[PDB]
Amino acid sequence: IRTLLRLVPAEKRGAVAGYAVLTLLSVLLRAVGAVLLIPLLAALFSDTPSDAWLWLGWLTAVTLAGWVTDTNTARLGFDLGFAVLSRTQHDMADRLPNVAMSWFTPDNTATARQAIAATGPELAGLVVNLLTPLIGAALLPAAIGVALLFVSVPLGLAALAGVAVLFGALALSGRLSRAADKVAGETNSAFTERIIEFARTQQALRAARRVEPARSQVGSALAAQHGAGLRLLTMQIPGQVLFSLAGQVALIGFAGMAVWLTVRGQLGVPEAIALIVVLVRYLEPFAAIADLAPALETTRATLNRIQAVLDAPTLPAGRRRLDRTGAAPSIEFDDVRFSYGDEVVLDGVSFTLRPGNTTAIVGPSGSGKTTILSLIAGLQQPASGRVLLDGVDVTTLDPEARRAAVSVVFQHPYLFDGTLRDNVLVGDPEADPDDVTAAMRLARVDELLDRLPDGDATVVGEGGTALSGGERQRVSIARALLKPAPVLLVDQATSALDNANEAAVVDALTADPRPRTRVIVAHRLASIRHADRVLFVEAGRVVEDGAIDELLAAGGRFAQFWA
Amino acid sequence: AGSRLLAPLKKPLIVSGVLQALITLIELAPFVLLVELARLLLGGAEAERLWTLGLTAVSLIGLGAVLAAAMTLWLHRVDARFAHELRGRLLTKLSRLPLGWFTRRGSASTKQLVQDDTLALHYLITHAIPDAVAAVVAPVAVLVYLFVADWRVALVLFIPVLVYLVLMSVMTIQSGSKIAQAPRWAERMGGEAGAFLEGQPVIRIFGGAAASRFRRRLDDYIDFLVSWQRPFVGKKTLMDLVTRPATFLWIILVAGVPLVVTGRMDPVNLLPFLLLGTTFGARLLGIGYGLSGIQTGMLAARRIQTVLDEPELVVRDRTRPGTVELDRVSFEYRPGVPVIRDVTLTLRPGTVTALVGPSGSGKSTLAALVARFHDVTQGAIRVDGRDIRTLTADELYRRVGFVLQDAQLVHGSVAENIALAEPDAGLERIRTAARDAQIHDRITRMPDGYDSVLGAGSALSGGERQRVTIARAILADTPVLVLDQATAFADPESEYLVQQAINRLTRDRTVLVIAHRLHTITHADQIVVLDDGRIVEVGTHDELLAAGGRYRGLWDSGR
Ligand code: A1IRY
Numbered sequence A: 001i002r003t004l005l006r007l008v009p010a011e012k013r014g015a016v017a018g019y020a021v022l023t024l025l026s027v028l029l030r031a032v033g034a035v036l037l038i039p040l041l042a043a044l045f046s047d048t049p050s051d052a053w054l055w056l057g058w059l060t061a062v063t064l065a066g067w068v069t070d071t072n073t074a075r076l077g078f079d080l081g082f083a084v085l086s087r088t089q090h091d092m093a094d095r096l097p098n099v100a101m102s103w104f105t106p107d108n109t110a111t112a113r114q115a116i117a118a119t120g121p122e123l124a125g126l127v128v129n130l131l132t133p134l135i136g137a138a139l140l141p142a143a144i145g146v147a148l149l150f151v152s153v154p155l156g157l158a159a160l161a162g163v164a165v166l167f168g169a170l171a172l173s174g175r176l177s178r179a180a181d182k183v184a185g186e187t188n189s190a191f192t193e194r195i196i197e198f199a200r201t202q203q204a205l206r207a208a209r210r211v212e213p214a215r216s217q218v219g220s221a222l223a224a225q226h227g228a229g230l231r232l233l234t235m236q237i238p239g240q241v242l243f244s245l246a247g248q249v250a251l252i253g254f255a256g257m258a259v260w261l262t263v264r265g266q267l268g269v270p271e272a273i274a275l276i277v278v279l280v281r282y283l284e285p286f287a288a289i290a291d292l293a294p295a296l297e298t299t300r301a302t303l304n305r306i307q308a309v310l311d312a313p314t315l316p317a318g319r320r321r322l323d324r325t326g327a328a329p330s331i332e333f334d335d336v337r338f339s340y341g342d343e344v345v346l347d348g349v350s351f352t353l354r355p356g357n358t359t360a361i362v363g364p365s366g367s368g369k370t371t372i373l374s375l376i377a378g379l380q381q382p383a384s385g386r387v388l389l390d391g392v393d394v395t396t397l398d399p400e401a402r403r404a405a406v407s408v409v410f411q412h413p414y415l416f417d418g419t420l421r422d423n424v425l426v427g428d429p430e431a432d433p434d435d436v437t438a439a440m441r442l443a444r445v446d447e448l449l450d451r452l453p454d455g456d457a458t459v460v461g462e463g464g465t466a467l468s469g470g471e472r473q474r475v476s477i478a479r480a481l482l483k484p485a486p487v488l489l490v491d492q493a494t495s496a497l498d499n500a501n502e503a504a505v506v507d508a509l510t511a512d513p514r515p516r517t518r519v520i521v522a523h524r525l526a527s528i529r530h531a532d533r534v535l536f537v538e539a540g541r542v543v544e545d546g547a548i549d550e551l552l553a554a555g556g557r558f559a560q561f562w563a
Numbered sequence B: 001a002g003s004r005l006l007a008p009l010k011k012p013l014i015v016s017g018v019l020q021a022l023i024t025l026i027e028l029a030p031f032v033l034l035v036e037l038a039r040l041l042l043g044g045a046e047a048e049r050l051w052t053l054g055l056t057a058v059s060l061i062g063l064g065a066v067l068a069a070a071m072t073l074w075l076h077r078v079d080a081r082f083a084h085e086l087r088g089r090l091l092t093k094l095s096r097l098p099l100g101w102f103t104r105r106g107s108a109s110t111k112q113l114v115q116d117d118t119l120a121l122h123y124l125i126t127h128a129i130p131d132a133v134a135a136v137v138a139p140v141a142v143l144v145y146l147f148v149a150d151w152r153v154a155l156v157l158f159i160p161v162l163v164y165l166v167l168m169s170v171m172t173i174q175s176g177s178k179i180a181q182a183p184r185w186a187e188r189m190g191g192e193a194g195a196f197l198e199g200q201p202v203i204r205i206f207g208g209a210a211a212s213r214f215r216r217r218l219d220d221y222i223d224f225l226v227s228w229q230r231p232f233v234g235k236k237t238l239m240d241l242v243t244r245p246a247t248f249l250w251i252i253l254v255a256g257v258p259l260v261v262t263g264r265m266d267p268v269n270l271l272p273f274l275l276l277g278t279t280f281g282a283r284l285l286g287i288g289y290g291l292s293g294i295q296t297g298m299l300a301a302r303r304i305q306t307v308l309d310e311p312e313l314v315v316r317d318r319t320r321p322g323t324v325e326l327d328r329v330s331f332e333y334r335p336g337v338p339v340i341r342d343v344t345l346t347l348r349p350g351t352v353t354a355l356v357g358p359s360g361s362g363k364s365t366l367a368a369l370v371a372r373f374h375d376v377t378q379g380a381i382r383v384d385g386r387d388i389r390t391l392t393a394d395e396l397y398r399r400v401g402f403v404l405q406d407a408q409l410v411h412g413s414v415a416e417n418i419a420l421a422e423p424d425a426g427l428e429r430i431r432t433a434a435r436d437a438q439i440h441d442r443i444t445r446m447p448d449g450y451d452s453v454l455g456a457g458s459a460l461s462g463g464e465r466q467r468v469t470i471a472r473a474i475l476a477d478t479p480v481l482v483l484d485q486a487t488a489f490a491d492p493e494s495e496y497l498v499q500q501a502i503n504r505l506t507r508d509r510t511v512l513v514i515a516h517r518l519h520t521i522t523h524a525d526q527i528v529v530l531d532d533g534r535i536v537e538v539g540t541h542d543e544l545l546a547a548g549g550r551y552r553g554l555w556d557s558g559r
């Protein structure tokens, strides 16, 4: 429950206190109503049955009050569950774009997906479905044992002693199937990630004959998931038996003391008959707690995943902003070092790029030229050194100002599953229709609109899989060009385009009217014609730089690169 | 179509119903014995009879508990095994549907199908029949017993029962449409979450969290959940209040105390009602809560059986080596939207065919048609003279290997990714294939070597993963090889080295190459220009340059 209170909105604590007060009041009303039968039946079986009117009046009041405290407790529990749901999902949605890219391991990616997947009604109704009956069931036999002290002290103590074994069974039950429930969750999440991989990588798996369950990775995950689920069913047997034995032990103490008092004469025969009914009410929570024990464990796993996302390490950020508004900034690396894990990517890369000029980065595969663009855009941050935009360190920039400074065309373009126009409008959702058509015209997406039957309303698939490789690449170019940012990072934006589209796109990047500091990565000579400067990056070091014609005449790596 | 799906569980479900009838009767018997024990207590009976009745009631409570536990365990095992077999069936079905199914569905839809629908069947095939039989048997038996005991105090028990039935009916009617809409919302939310996680760089550069479609869909889904679960939970709590043992006890006493106080009822006659009249409310609440689960299970069964009935790439039984032949092939991703228009081509062993053309002309879809990811709308495709529809997946993909345009790596070691088409291949073969693809050195530089995992985050550069897929195809070692835009992310040096390795390894093989870089396919035996889904000119490099057609224009644009 402490983890839940950690996740409650700070402006919702008034309802939690009110919920906790009414939850206790509901338990006491239920316990008092059960014990009111003992005076009621003793009076009813006596020589003056009219004396039961007083105890029936108090039962009506306790019964009516219980209805009101239970409807209100359900209303507050519904609000608390959905209030907690909205904050956690909104918090995770806001935090995840700021989480460091290294956090997104396959395990953490699976955890984040499953944490987001808990938006359904199961987590929203957590308070009404789990806490309210679990607290009501756990405290009712304790409350009945307290209310029986007013009927008979040794009777209440025997009832209370049966609650010590109830909490003992509750405490120990989770530890009996802790390991099995953990392995079941791991194999279940692993099976989820293989299904998504199965659907995404369907084409490559079919060619490899790794698509049938007897040969696929998802088939192996299904077998492991099934075996873990069957193990969980068997290892939950001690938990349910333990709650049953607690109820059996509780019954003997309650019934044994009631029989002992009645034989002693301290307890009347009608009172003992009324205590059978109280004993049934006293043992109902023992069965209810057993039913809620499996639900308590899955909830604890769910909240751990949500807390894992909220504990994810965010990127360093500041409050600075660029001085000029819309002017092309200068890009410079000041002894920037970067490493993925222990492997060094960049080693002392230093350069300066003039404002409003096009620069080309070329070199072998794996040299580090995609990492350089990510550092400029702020997707990654240097291990040491400092990337500066117009003399301002990027790590000190406002996140709102940092994203507004750079528009990126990524090496592997990713469109969102919607229409083609919506993917272009991601660059600038408030852009006018003239700006959107200008961006699509520049990126040669206007060819697609007439070529395709639906035009820009063409429903793109997951990623951009319902478009060809060069068609979704041009859509990602139109997205970047639509954004009015003063820095453009082009990461092989004509890799999947023919020569006719390569030439038109390359001219379009230069022909963009607004000023930008453009950095272009390409493996084609014809894609860097309009670059004012070139950076030959090899093994994370700028081996040489200068003009395109100058480097060709130098006969260095740049000349041999295109030989 | 839940009956057809759940037919294999015909006998377990009937057994569950009859055994649950027996179990609820055994659970009601202790309270009849306790009523008799109370009657003997008021009569001052000898201690022997009281001990016998008490011990019998306690033993029957224990028996009922152990029998219910055993039945739940057995039925949950039955449900688990059914879910496992059904998931195996679903994976086998999806293994041979057209790829257009996957493209138009998405990964979230597939995950919801294989996992969420099979889990939604759980209540239907594990709890629905037991809950129904318990809620039918226990109230009927108890009410018959209590009407025999006293009809006046038995009639008042119909008030909570009728109120509960009205609440249950209105709750089910109100929540049916929202339950129908729920899986669509879950699928959409899963798709948005998957896109949000996969497209994180696009989110970070463009818009961030605030301007993300994920947050808008999240708000809409939470609004739908609130509108669904608020009246539903209100009705649920009212039903819980109506059927609670306290409510039955209170209304029993309100009916009986005026009777007992007057000379209208002996108090002993209230012993049944206090001991049996408060037993069957929870069993009624079980079905009241389970109606929604039954509805969700029925819809999930309908969806699962709809997918299991889907048309697939059926292998015909109709029933030069190394030859591929497309004969008047046409293809349509969507009906009425042609993308391949009467394409005739022949790839022969010992030759290289370079399929070039404008972006979006249909090169990748033609390659996928050769792979039989989709069936040709018209014409035919033959391999070694055998129509690909007559070949099984093993027969087809042992003859033709593919390097797709998108470098898809599976979660696993680099050796697993290179050995995807032959997981039993030895390490020496994997190393040679990696060397041929100019990727062995990079894998050597990795910390774990060839065991380094290729999941999220621990990725490679684009050229490196493209080379890994090229090594995969090299290790497959098929007589026919297709290379869709291979070496597009490769630098000229790596491109030259891997192309030399491919030429060495496929001298006597059939090779199809798709390349926007026309300077790398001038040596091809045949060059096919595909424009607007049709072949516009075929020839060698010099012949196509002399022709002055689309190839000449693309070549001039490339220089
Ligand atoms: C399946 C489903 C479907 C249907 C159809 C088919 C059928 C099949 C058949 C099967 C059968 C099985 C059965 C078994 C059992 C029997 C019956 C019961 C019998 C019985 O129960 Fe008794 O016990 C038990 C176990 N026990 C065991 O184990 C043994 C030992 C330990 O025992 C003894 O000796 C002792 C004494 C007393 C008498 C006997 N008793 O009692 N005891 C004991 O301990 C006691 C203590 O407390 C109790 C109680 C209390 C409260 C409440 C309840 C009860 O009760 N108690 C069982 C389980 C459950 C549980 N419990 O509980």
Ligand SMILES: Nc1ncnc2c1ncn2[C@@H]1O[C@H](COP(=O)(O)OP(=O)(O)OP(=O)(O)O)[C@@H](O)[C@H]1O
Binding pocket: A340, A345, A363, A364, A365, A366, A367, A368, A369, A370, A371, A372, A411, B457, B458, B459, B460, B461, B462, B463, B464, B489, B491
């Ligand atoms: N997510 C990652 N985890 C680990 N290493 C990575 C990751 N991304 C890239 N690398 C490594 O970083 C080095 C440089 O990667 P980068 O993406 O900058 O390459 P590149 O120069 O753009 O290559 P290419 O020309 O092939 O696209 C390579 O060794 C690559 O293996």
Ligand SMILES: Nc1ncnc2c1ncn2[C@@H]1O[C@H](COP(=O)(O)OP(=O)(O)OP(=O)(O)O)[C@@H](O)[C@H]1O
Binding pocket: A461, A465, A466, A467, A468, A469, A470, A471, A496, A497, A498, B100, B103, B333, B334, B339, B358, B359, B360, B361, B362, B363, B364, B365, B366, B405
């Ligand atoms: N899954 C799909 N659903 C619908 N249309 C599709 C799908 N995949 C591709 N297309 C359409 O098929 C047409 C041809 O695309 P294809 O990928 O076959 O061409 P391509 O020559 O390989 O292209 P590129 O050179 O850009 O990679 C394009 O108009 C694309 O819109």
Ligand SMILES: [Mg+2]
Binding pocket: A369, A370, A411, B461, B462, B463
């Ligand atoms: Mg790169």
Ligand SMILES: [Mg+2]
Binding pocket: A468, A469, A470, B363, B364, B365, B405
């Ligand atoms: Mg393509």
Ligand SMILES: [Zn+2]
Binding pocket: B076, B122, B126
């Ligand atoms: Zn269950």
